[PDB]
Structure formats: structure tokens, C-alpha cells
Amino acid sequence: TKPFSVPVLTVEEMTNSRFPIPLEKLFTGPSSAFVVQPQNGRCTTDGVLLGTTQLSPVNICTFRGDVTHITGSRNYTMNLASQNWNDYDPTEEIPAPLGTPDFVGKIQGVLTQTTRTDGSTRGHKATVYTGSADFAPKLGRVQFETDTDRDFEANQNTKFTPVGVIQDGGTTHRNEPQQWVLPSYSGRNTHNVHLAPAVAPTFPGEQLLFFRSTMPGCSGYPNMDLDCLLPQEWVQYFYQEAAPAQSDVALLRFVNPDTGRVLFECKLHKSGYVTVAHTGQHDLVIPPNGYFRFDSWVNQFYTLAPM
Amino acid sequence: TKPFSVPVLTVEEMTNSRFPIPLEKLFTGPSSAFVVQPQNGRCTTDGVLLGTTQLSPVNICTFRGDVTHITGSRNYTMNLASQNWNDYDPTEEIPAPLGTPDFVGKIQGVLTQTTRTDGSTRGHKATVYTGSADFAPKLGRVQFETDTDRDFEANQNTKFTPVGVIQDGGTTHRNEPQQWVLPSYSGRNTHNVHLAPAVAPTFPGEQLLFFRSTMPGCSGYPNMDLDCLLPQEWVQYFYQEAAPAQSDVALLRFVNPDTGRVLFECKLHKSGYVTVAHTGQHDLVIPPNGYFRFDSWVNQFYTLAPM
Amino acid sequence: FRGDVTHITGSRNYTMNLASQNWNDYDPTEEIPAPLGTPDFVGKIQGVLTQTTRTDGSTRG
Amino acid sequence: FRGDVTHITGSRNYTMNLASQNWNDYDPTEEIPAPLGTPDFVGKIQGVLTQTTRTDGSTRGHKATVYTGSADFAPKLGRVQFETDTDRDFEANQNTKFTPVGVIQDGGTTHRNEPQQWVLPSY
Amino acid sequence: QVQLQESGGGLVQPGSSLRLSCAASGFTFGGYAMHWVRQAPGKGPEWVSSINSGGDITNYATSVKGRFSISRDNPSKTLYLQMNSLRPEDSAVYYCKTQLANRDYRGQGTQVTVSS
Amino acid sequence: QVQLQESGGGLVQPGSSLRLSCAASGFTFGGYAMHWVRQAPGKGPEWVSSINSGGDITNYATSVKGRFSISRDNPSKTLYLQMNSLRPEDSAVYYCKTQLANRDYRGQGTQVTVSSHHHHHH
Amino acid sequence: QVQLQESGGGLVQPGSSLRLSCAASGFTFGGYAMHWVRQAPGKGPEWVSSINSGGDITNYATSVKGRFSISRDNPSKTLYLQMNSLRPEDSAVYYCKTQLANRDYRGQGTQVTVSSHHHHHH
Amino acid sequence: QVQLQESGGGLVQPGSSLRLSCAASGFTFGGYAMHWVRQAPGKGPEWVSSINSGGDITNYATSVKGRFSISRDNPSKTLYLQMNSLRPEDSAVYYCKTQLANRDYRGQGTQVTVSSHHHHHH
């Protein structure tokens, strides 16, 4: 019915798929030393959402449910609900609730709550440590550290809105968060399930192309780099278009609409990630009005022009 | 020639265009007693963004700039930048910076800041009162009330992330925010300019159809109803498709995809709002898999089946 | 028309709940097409809605 | 009805520019209410739109409905809209005919309230 | 022929809820206003509630407002009366009735008795 | 009485554009379809264009489709014909006409000559 | 091959208690979250309870929370569900299920009927 | 009949001061934000300063902060720009502009040359 394509959107017009913030730039670098297996921002070119990926960027790294205070602390256990406040189902074929954070770190935001009988409301600073033994979103349980020990009600609708990340300033700067380390979604010593696969360039001379943002920092000296494999708008577009993949690799050209000149070309793999021909770490220099354009299905052994 | 359509998305898959939260339900009610003139979520069906509308769901009600401390207070004045940190120009043909809140109320969130030299970060609770004499975003000036009188640095990038709304619990409950009262974007006694037009049904027996969310509440007893005229995904989709309107009114059917049964029909006007045939306030009861489907181009005087 | 009115929230419109022309209850099951005196043409009839508050005799139109 | 059809993109609807029964040009200024034989009642007439492509003799027929109460039903000015089951088969500038079969009623509605045989269309 | 048959009555406790039904046949049902009336011993009949074809216009006797709810399903040609917070003075035979052209029709009725 | 008066004709070059007007009085104008017809030298009158009351239905003779545009302003009871890409064969007297009940009415017309020739006399 | 076998079901009176068991084999069992689900008459399956490898995280459907208790023994590869204060609406086939990599596995189930009625036949 | 007319420009030495005026007519002036813009030869215009109706909100381009001061008098419908410590790069045509409903209006402008040079001709 419709050919495959990518949206006419500039980098700065799109959104990170791993945290609810805009994209800022493109980056490429070697990744053979670590595992690249994010679960948000995962979608095939023919529109199959993978991992924990869902469609709206505003739901990324949010949680909702009811909370219970943990005596002797300012911590609360959230029993997770689905987006419409029904029971969440741990038996679905997903690694964790869609939108769950997919990195180990300390995400700071705000827990808000409404009391249904009178409409009274309250909100408090809250941090979720996704490396904690009490971080078990796959089974519907997540712990938050807050600035209160008494100002949340039980059995009332409660939501976490994410803002940024933090780091312990007394320790090595930028040692957290760790964006490529997956949480254990069911807690300690329990294997993750139904994951989107790890990704790696397989063609000699190629590296992943990353869509990069800088997360807000709320305390300390955090590593604020956040790289996603697909802009959220590409996830949304592929889902909408549902165009069948005619090969395993879509050839894209990055074009300047003012001149029509192509700045570089890249491979969009059917399973949902991009590679370029480059060796080394490099911040791409692009015209702010440039965008990606699908030009041909190609064979997996197509040799890209160096970037 | 390019065919028009609306996205195949359920209500709960979509996002409010006036605050960065998911849609929850559809609502219709009379609105002839007040002016309906939101500036976010405004887009023609052939993809012209109007008002303060921009493409990013996560930039709605966010501010970016540098801050100056108001001595003797915990208040800071933000000198606004554009959403990509470029200079903001008050003489552009817009009512206010894109994404500016389009209602009078008290929006609570977090002001975050990174010091560029060492990557140190800080975040603080902040409230913007969009009815304040110091709320003048069209002229690049917005005041925030924070919980600090010293921690923010001058000449450093600073961001406001919105979370929810508040209300003074000692006054009549749910008396604020007022979602249909536009702020005065240049401050006291100054006319707004370059507004997207007010909207009203022109056919007898019709009412606007509203895409409704519930804003998080952070304190007091706020009115958390938030109605937009178009989902943010429709804005994004119309912009991307840029399909010419063949008449003034697109006829949409709301369909259950399991049964093909039409729940109701509605008119999508080319200037970007929806009407239904109903009298009175009504929360629509819909199947959670229902979606909108464009069927044909009609005229302003097509008679809708009653919903 | 005579009766009591209910405001239609969000509008400047009111629903009048009809009484009989002598303020008695109106019965929709009578063998008539509509209350006696009801307009018998399709059109927009303009006029004045008046009301008296029983307790103090305050009035409005 | 006879004429050529223009697709309304994004829909399964087509606008037919009316010709005379002998395929001659139709003249809206004649002293008649509408082309001779035009339906004279308000309702939904179902039939089949057929077309032949003159260069190769290829043919096609598709289910089609004309709502004679529609604002796009203007046979006196040579314009009639059909709702069909296709968005792609019909060529422009090729002879196209509507053969009537019967009438339909919106079945979720009070039975037998349409067609209205004594209500003239607005031609 | 036009036929109306009410059902759902019975002997119930004050404060309970009851749903009455009227099955219609012999006319389109859709397109016609429908009514509930009731008649208690030693009393003339009294109107209870009315509803137009689409159900967007309803009305109620003052004595039942806020407690009773009228509805209809045109495809099944069924009229309903949902009766909540029933009181002894609600006891009566409840009839369903309509008007077609210049003739009125009503069913034989269903007895509702509210008592301790 | 019903009155129709056309205006705007003249001598113009092939390829140029020209707008004709027709002022109507003596009836509501709104509510009635209006038409442009034309009569070339040595021929009978032929239909050019038609428009319904609100202007949401228009139609054109095959020979002028894509080049002509009919429109109307009901408050001022004026009919218009915008003519573009004019051809020699467009030369004719142009009339506005309508039909009310069972009677037709036509204006006296306005002459339009499309030619590069410019030697003419009575 | 992966195998899950439930046991313990029966017909019991409202308010009573019943313990179900699931014997697992063909995988490590330890290291994997385990779940109980149930299918009542006329309905599809619905989640009942979940437990992670060490049992320090558990959760329960709202309808059973406070009445049921999930537990496991990793050495014996057995999963347990203690049901208390049984209600008629708890009647259903109860299944044990797990997820390994990108595949799900469920046992054939055990039937649980909660009724104060004493007269049933096939 | 919206009109804006600037005055007060001229040739001045670096470091000197200059006060520009913009006379408005044809609209209420009070009630509308007003702006100063400047444009150097061969370049596009750039925003300089803005002021709301009562003058309790003002803003300035970073390059003129601390040196320029915008003010207005609503009874006389006059806008002012006080320019102190002028620099060569401040040289430009300065013009005032406003926005009314969905339309913008600017004046013709006044030339400001900050230079030790004083040989110029048409």
C-alpha cells in the first residue's frame, strides 16, 4: 500500500525515546566494549514495538499506582497500576511495564497524589534508584525515596513524573547513571525476560549512530549523556505506517533541504537501529535543517560512503 | 491530491496537546458562555501550526533560559531562550514562545541547572503563576517562585520541567486553574497578539468534542480538568502529512476495530477542532480499542447522527 | 411558555420544564400533539423570559 | 446517470460530471428542473457504477450509492456524488454509467423512515 | 396489532430497586414517544415518565424525580423503567403506554407492591 | 421587476485575463442558481458556467474548464466570471441568466473580443 | 523439555482454605519469576500472583490481596499458592506459568470450585 | 491609518548618548507592546528592546543591556529609546514596530551612525 519512509523531521524537532526530553545531536562511537541493549526506543521498521517501548514520549520513565510508607524511612513502595489505573499484569510478554526506565541510575522527579473523596492533592520530591533490590517493576513493585515520612495517603492514585538524574558528588564525577546497564526488572537474582536484543554493527568499519540528548541533572555530577537507537518520532511513524520491510537494510541519506546536498548516508536496519561507516568517537556537525531520507532497500553487505 | 487521514491511535495511546500527559477520555459539553481559544494544540488539517503550538509533546509548558535572583526573595526572573537555546525574538508573529502555557493558573515543577564548566547540577521546586504581573513570556520574561534564595547561578542554562498545578486550599475548591482563560502574554493591561482564533460550533445542535486529561495536582484542591481540541499526535500527523483539505469539514467515524461497529461520528473542521451532535455535558463511554477513521469530505452543514 | 428553568452548564441556554398555562403539572400522556398554545411552525421566536422569586418578590427579565 | 467521474482523494467517493443520455454535453440552462430521468425523491439509491476504458476495452463495475438528499447531489448543475466500494479502480475522462437497483435505509434507525417518496430533492 | 406487555413487578422491601420492562410489537417503536403511568387502588391513573425516540428527551413526575430512570432499546422494541429507593406509596399497577397517530394504546400492566 | 446587467467586456489580447460582472435586482438572488452563457458571431448561445446559491456547487463547459472561475456575492447580488488564458475562440457576447419558478431571465450582455488584431470600426 | 504440573484443587466451602502446588522441571526454576493465573467459567485467564527468584518480591491481584499467599522452594522446584477465605468468585482453573527468554510456559491447571451447594454432577 | 514615525537619529561619536522617539497614531498605542528593532546596511533586522503597556515589563538584547533604556508615554502615544555609551557596532537604522491582532506595523526608521567619520554624501 505505502512504501517505507522516515519522517521529514530535523534532529532538533524530535524527542529521545529513552527519557522525555528533546534530541540535541547525533553521535557515533565504538561499542564493542559494552552491551547495547536498551529496551525503550525499540521498534522494527515495519512497526512492531519491542522491549518496553510504547508510543508517547510523556510516558517514558513514569510510574503510577498506590503507595505504602516504609516505617523507619522516607521511602514508599509503589504498587504499580496500568496507565488507566487498573491492575498491572506481570504475565504479559514484556520485560516490564512499557516505559519503565532501561538503565541503572537514580532518577529524580516528583510523586503527586490526589485523594478521590475530596480532590485534595499533594506532591513531593522523589527519587527512584533502578539498581535497588526493591526495583521490581516487572512484578509491579517499585520503591521511591522521598522527602516525607507522613504526607502520602494509602490507596490513592499516585504518579511519578521524571525530571532528571543525580549523582553522589563525593564520588568520582560522572560515574552514574550507567545508560547501557539494564536494571533487573524483577529484582535480585531474577533473569529479565522478553527483552529486545542487544545490537552491534556486524559490517567491518561500521559503528552505531546514536540519537543523543543531555538529561537534566538535579544534584551532583551525573553522566548526563543519553543515547537512543531511534527517535521516538520514528517509533511513532513506523508503527503508524506499518510498511513491510523489503530487505534487511534501508539506506538513508541525511540531506540539507536548502542545497539538496547529501551530508552522509547510513544504514537503518530492519530490526530498528542505525549504523554509519566511521571509526572513532565523533560528534556529528549537521545543519539544523537537515533530515533523513529513505532512498533504497539494500543488501546487508552494502558498503556505505565514509561519514 | 495527497490523501487526508487521521492516525490509527486509541485515545489512551495519545497525548494532551496542552500539558505533557496522556489523554484519558473524550468529553463533550456546551461552551458558548465562555471563549474557547487555547493556543497549544492548534493546527489546521493540512498541517499549519497555529498559536503557540509546536511539535514536541515534552516541550509543552517548559521554559528554558537564564535566571536572575530577585533580591530579598526566593523568586527568580528567567530571561527566555527558544526551545533549542537560540535567542528568543519578541517581534516574531506569535502570541508567545512556542509551548508557553495557555491557561491562567499556578503550575508547579522543577527548575534544573547545569554549570557548564564543571558539570555540577542542581534542581529546585518551582512554581510559575501565569496570571502574575511578572508573567510576560511574549517579552521574554517569566518569574518563578522557588524554595531557594541562593542556589541558582547566573548566566547558566536553566530549565523548567512542569509537573502539575496547585490551588490555595483556603479558597473555594477547584477555583483554579482556569483552563479557558488565556494568560496576558506581555503582562498587565497589554493585548495578546497573533492568536489562533476562538472556536465555537456553528451548526445548530453541535458541541465541541474535547480530548480530556487530568493534570497532576501538587497542593490544595485544584481543578485538574484539561481539555484540548486536538491530540498532540494529530498535530504531529497533520504537519507530517500536509494533506490538502478538499472541503471545510472532514467526517470522522469512531470505530471499534474488532466489530467494525461505529460508536459515533463527528466533524473535524479544517481549521482544527472537532464537533459532535449532542446537548449537555457528557463523558463518552468508548471501547478502549476504539479509534478515529476519516471517511469523507463533507460541508459545514452536514447533519451528524446524534451521539 | 410557563414553568421552571434549569441552566445548561457552559451555555447561556436554559431548559424550561413546562407547567400548564395555569401553573398546574403538565401531563405528556394527554391526547394532544403538545401543550395548548405551543407554536405550530418551525422558526426562531424571540421574546423575553421573566421570573419572580417567590420569597421576596424580586424579578428579572 | 451517465458521465465521467473524478475521485475525491482520501475517500471512496466520486464526483460524476453529468452528460446527456446520448453522452452529449449537458446544459444546465434548459427549462427543466434537472436532467430528464433524475430521481424525484429524497433517499439512498443503491446501484452499480460501470466503466469502460476506450483504448483497450477493459471494464469494471463497483457497488455505488447516491444520496439524493446530499448537498453534493446537484444534478441540475451537472454534479452528482457517488459513494463506492473503491478508491482506485475508476479512470478519469472515461464513459461511466450508474445503473439503479434499489434503495437502502440506515438500519440502526427507525424502520421505513426513508426513502421519502413525496419529498423532492434540491436539484 | 399493536401490543405492549409489561413485566418485572413484584413484592419488594422499601428502599430496594426494581427494573420494569415493556415489550412492544406491531409498530416501529422507534419513532414514537413512550410513557410509563401507574394507578393505585382507589386512585386515578397518574403519569410517571416519558421518553422520545432517541432517548435524548426524558421527563419525570415530581414524585419520582431523582429515583426513577426511563430508557429504551429500539432494536429490541423494549421500554425500561429503573426504580430506585422504592417507597410504599410507589405501590401500584405500572402501565406502559404510547400514542400512534390519533389513538392511544397501553399494556395490561405489572403490579408493584412496596411493603415492610 | 427582475433585472440583470452585465459589465466588464472589452477587446483584449490572447492569453490575458478578464473579469465580468452581473448586477442583479428584483429577486432575492440568493436561493437561485445563476449561469453565464455566451454567443459567438454566427452561432447560437452556449452554456459557459453555473453556480448554486451558496457557491459550493459550480460547473463549467468543457471548453473553459480550468481557465474560467464563476463566483457570486449574495449580499450585493452580484455574479462574477473570472476568465484566464483567453483564446480567440472565447470571443462572444457574454450574458448572465437565471431561472425563477417557470420563467427564465437574461441580461443584455457584454461583448468580449480576444484578438491581436486592432483595426476595427463600426 | 520445560514442564509445569499443578495439583491441589477440589471443591470446597466458602471461607475455607486450600493450598495449590506446581512441580517444575526442565529449567533452573531458580532465577526466574513464577506466576499463578486462573480462568473462571465463561472468562479468559487472569493474573493471580507473582514471585521473584528469592521470594523477596511478591504481588497479588487486587481481588485476592490479603487472602492468598505465594511461595516457592527452589531446591525442589516447587511453587505454592495458599488460598484463604475462599469466595465463590474464586472458582476457576488455576495454572502455574513462567517466562524464559522470549517464550511463555503454562501448566495444564488444577480445578478449584468454591460453593456451599452440595449437588453437582457431570 | 496605523502610523509610526521615528526621529532623533544622527551622526555621533563613540561613547556619546542619543535619545530616539517614535510617534504613533491610528491605534490606541496604550494596551499594546512596542518594540525597537535595528538594521545595519546589507544585513537583516535584529530585535533591540520591548516594553508592555504600563512599562512595568521591559527587555533588551544582550548586546545593549545596561546601556539602552526603553520607555513610553501613552497619553502622547510616544515610544522612546535612550541610548548611552554608543559603540560603532550600534550603527544602524533604528525603527519601532508593533503588533495589532494578527498584523505587524513598522516605521520607516531613523539612521544612527556612531563614528568618528564625518564625510558622507548621497
Tab-separated table of N, CA and C in Angstrom, chain A residues 58-108:
chain	number	residue	atom	x	y	z
A	58	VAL	N	5.746	11.177	26.657
A	58	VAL	CA	5.495	11.679	28.007
A	58	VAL	C	5.336	10.562	29.026
A	59	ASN	N	5.151	9.314	28.583
A	59	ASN	CA	5.042	8.179	29.499
A	59	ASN	C	6.382	7.542	29.836
A	60	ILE	N	7.467	7.967	29.190
A	60	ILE	CA	8.761	7.338	29.409
A	60	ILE	C	9.277	7.696	30.798
A	61	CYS	N	9.668	6.674	31.554
A	61	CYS	CA	10.193	6.806	32.909
A	61	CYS	C	9.159	7.357	33.887
A	62	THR	N	7.871	7.185	33.587
A	62	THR	CA	6.806	7.446	34.546
A	62	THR	C	6.348	6.144	35.195
A	63	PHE	N	5.734	6.287	36.369
A	63	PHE	CA	5.128	5.188	37.104
A	63	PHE	C	3.841	5.705	37.715
A	64	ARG	N	2.874	4.811	37.908
A	64	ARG	CA	1.685	5.194	38.652
A	64	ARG	C	1.136	3.985	39.397
A	65	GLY	N	0.384	4.272	40.453
A	65	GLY	CA	-0.211	3.248	41.308
A	65	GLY	C	-0.585	3.843	42.661
A	66	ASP	N	-0.518	2.999	43.689
A	66	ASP	CA	-0.762	3.427	45.059
A	66	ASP	C	0.511	3.204	45.866
A	67	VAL	N	0.677	3.959	46.956
A	67	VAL	CA	1.935	3.913	47.698
A	67	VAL	C	1.682	3.547	49.152
A	68	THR	N	2.687	2.909	49.747
A	68	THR	CA	2.683	2.490	51.142
A	68	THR	C	3.982	2.948	51.788
A	69	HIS	N	3.873	3.598	52.939
A	69	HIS	CA	5.065	4.084	53.613
A	69	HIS	C	5.857	2.937	54.234
A	70	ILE	N	7.181	3.057	54.190
A	70	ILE	CA	8.095	2.095	54.799
A	70	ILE	C	8.555	2.674	56.132
A	71	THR	N	8.042	2.111	57.227
A	71	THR	CA	8.412	2.568	58.564
A	71	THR	C	9.924	2.689	58.716
A	72	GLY	N	10.350	3.758	59.380
A	72	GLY	CA	11.758	3.984	59.630
A	72	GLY	C	12.516	4.631	58.497
A	73	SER	N	11.819	5.216	57.527
A	73	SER	CA	12.464	5.818	56.375
A	73	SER	C	11.564	6.917	55.829
A	74	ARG	N	12.057	7.594	54.794
A	74	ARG	CA	11.237	8.450	53.949
A	74	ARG	C	10.929	7.776	52.615
A	75	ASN	N	10.943	6.446	52.594
A	75	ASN	CA	10.711	5.665	51.390
A	75	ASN	C	9.278	5.159	51.339
A	76	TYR	N	8.803	4.938	50.113
A	76	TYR	CA	7.464	4.434	49.844
A	76	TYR	C	7.558	3.326	48.814
A	77	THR	N	6.740	2.296	48.979
A	77	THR	CA	6.612	1.252	47.971
A	77	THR	C	5.408	1.584	47.109
A	78	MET	N	5.626	1.696	45.797
A	78	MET	CA	4.533	1.825	44.844
A	78	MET	C	4.122	0.460	44.318
A	79	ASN	N	2.835	0.159	44.456
A	79	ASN	CA	2.212	-0.984	43.803
A	79	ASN	C	1.718	-0.471	42.460
A	80	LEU	N	2.294	-0.976	41.374
A	80	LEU	CA	2.056	-0.367	40.072
A	80	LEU	C	0.660	-0.679	39.554
A	81	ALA	N	0.047	0.329	38.947
A	81	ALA	CA	-1.156	0.185	38.147
A	81	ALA	C	-0.809	0.387	36.679
A	82	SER	N	-1.738	-0.003	35.814
A	82	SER	CA	-1.609	0.346	34.408
A	82	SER	C	-1.952	1.823	34.209
A	83	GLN	N	-1.797	2.305	32.972
A	83	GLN	CA	-1.965	3.732	32.714
A	83	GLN	C	-3.356	4.228	33.087
A	84	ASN	N	-4.382	3.394	32.925
A	84	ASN	CA	-5.746	3.770	33.273
A	84	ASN	C	-6.136	3.346	34.684
A	85	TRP	N	-5.157	3.034	35.532
A	85	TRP	CA	-5.348	2.782	36.949
A	85	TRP	C	-5.980	1.427	37.236
A	86	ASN	N	-6.040	0.527	36.265
A	86	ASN	CA	-6.392	-0.845	36.581
A	86	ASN	C	-5.151	-1.612	37.031
A	87	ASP	N	-5.377	-2.831	37.508
A	87	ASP	CA	-4.279	-3.722	37.849
A	87	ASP	C	-3.290	-3.835	36.692
A	88	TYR	N	-2.007	-3.821	37.033
A	88	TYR	CA	-0.955	-4.163	36.088
A	88	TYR	C	-0.753	-5.676	36.106
A	89	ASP	N	-0.472	-6.258	34.930
A	89	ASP	CA	-0.380	-7.709	34.768
A	89	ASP	C	1.060	-8.162	34.534
A	90	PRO	N	1.741	-8.736	35.538
A	90	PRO	CA	3.135	-9.160	35.339
A	90	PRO	C	3.314	-10.303	34.345
A	91	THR	N	2.248	-10.926	33.848
A	91	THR	CA	2.396	-12.101	32.994
A	91	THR	C	2.376	-11.759	31.509
A	92	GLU	N	2.330	-10.479	31.157
A	92	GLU	CA	2.394	-10.092	29.757
A	92	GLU	C	3.796	-10.359	29.207
A	93	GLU	N	3.882	-10.524	27.886
A	93	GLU	CA	5.138	-10.901	27.235
A	93	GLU	C	6.014	-9.671	26.979
A	94	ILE	N	6.341	-8.990	28.072
A	94	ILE	CA	7.190	-7.800	28.057
A	94	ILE	C	8.149	-7.872	29.232
A	95	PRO	N	9.284	-7.167	29.142
A	95	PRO	CA	10.272	-7.231	30.240
A	95	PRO	C	9.815	-6.540	31.512
A	96	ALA	N	8.885	-5.609	31.402
A	96	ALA	CA	8.497	-4.691	32.460
A	96	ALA	C	7.397	-3.811	31.889
A	97	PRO	N	6.706	-3.026	32.710
A	97	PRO	CA	5.681	-2.124	32.171
A	97	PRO	C	6.272	-1.232	31.087
A	98	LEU	N	5.499	-0.990	30.035
A	98	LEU	CA	6.017	-0.154	28.965
A	98	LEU	C	6.387	1.222	29.508
A	99	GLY	N	7.558	1.720	29.092
A	99	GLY	CA	8.069	2.992	29.573
A	99	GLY	C	8.960	2.911	30.798
A	100	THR	N	9.063	1.747	31.431
A	100	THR	CA	9.969	1.577	32.561
A	100	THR	C	11.370	2.045	32.178
A	101	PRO	N	12.092	2.726	33.070
A	101	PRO	CA	13.485	3.085	32.769
A	101	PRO	C	14.287	1.850	32.378
A	102	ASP	N	15.190	2.017	31.407
A	102	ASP	CA	16.010	0.909	30.930
A	102	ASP	C	17.490	1.131	31.222
A	103	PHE	N	17.804	1.852	32.295
A	103	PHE	CA	19.193	1.998	32.701
A	103	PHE	C	19.257	2.043	34.216
A	104	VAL	N	20.435	1.725	34.745
A	104	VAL	CA	20.676	1.738	36.182
A	104	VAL	C	21.146	3.131	36.573
A	105	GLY	N	20.425	3.752	37.491
A	105	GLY	CA	20.747	5.104	37.896
A	105	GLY	C	19.718	5.584	38.886
A	106	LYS	N	19.866	6.843	39.275
A	106	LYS	CA	18.977	7.480	40.232
A	106	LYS	C	18.233	8.576	39.489
A	107	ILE	N	16.950	8.348	39.246
A	107	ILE	CA	16.109	9.280	38.506
A	107	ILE	C	15.305	10.086	39.509
A	108	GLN	N	15.448	11.404	39.464
A	108	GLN	CA	14.735	12.268	40.384
A	108	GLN	C	13.539	12.871	39.672
